[PDB]
Amino acid sequence: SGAIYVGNYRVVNRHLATHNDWANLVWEDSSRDLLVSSTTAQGCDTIARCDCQTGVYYCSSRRKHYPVSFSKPSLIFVEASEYYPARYQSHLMLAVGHSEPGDCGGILRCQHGVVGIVSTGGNGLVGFADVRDLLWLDEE
Numbered sequence: 001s002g003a004i005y006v007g008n009y010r011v012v013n014r015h016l017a018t019h020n021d022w023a024n025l026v027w028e029d030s031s032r033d034l035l036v037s038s039t040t041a042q043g044c045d046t047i048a049r050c051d052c053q054t055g056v057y058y059c060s061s062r063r064k065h066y067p068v069s070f071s072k073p074s075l076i077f078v079e080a081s082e083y084y085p086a087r088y089q090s091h092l093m094l095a096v097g098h099s100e101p102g103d104c105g106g107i108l109r110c111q112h113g114v115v116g117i118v119s120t121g122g123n124g125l126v127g128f129a130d131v132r133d134l135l136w137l138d139e140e
């Protein structure tokens with residue numbers, strides 16, 4: 001589990017969104033595994049605006065943050081899970097690292113701010129849904 005809290009937005013994995021998220025919906029995209037809902041309180045996270053390929057992510061199944069090198073956001077075929085059939089997921093970045101299903105939502109960050117959240121994994125890989133292209137998270 002986990003979310004990004006930037007401005008009056010909450011960014012979560014679409015497959016983990018609650019009824020309150022869907023009832024306060026700003027934007028959602030199944031192909032990216034992302035959903036954004038509105039918040040009453042202002043958040044403290046800031047979004048990175050960059051092309052970094054090195055950063056640190058939080059792994060809840062280890063209670064640890066790990067430094068990683070990750071690929072650029074791409075269209076990747078992801079195997080079936082409890083939440084999606086096997087399909088192409090867009091804007092996805094891969095790294096070598098531990099992940100389990102409940103690690104979704106952990107933040108990946110670089111020197112510039114939040115880069116994305118854990119969305120996929122297995123066999124020593126972790127995949128992150130990028131948010132750096134969503135410029136509108138910084139305003140309104």
Ligand SMILES: O=C(NCCc1cocn1)c1ccccc1
Pocket residue numbers: 015033078079080081082083084089099100101102103104119120121122
């Ligand atoms: O179940 C997982 N992800 C659920 C969401 C998903 C995105 O594409 C397909 N399902 C998962 C599995 C192992 C490690 C980390 C994450």
Ligand SMILES: [Zn+2]
Pocket residue numbers: 048049050051052110111112113
């Ligand atoms: Zn960066």
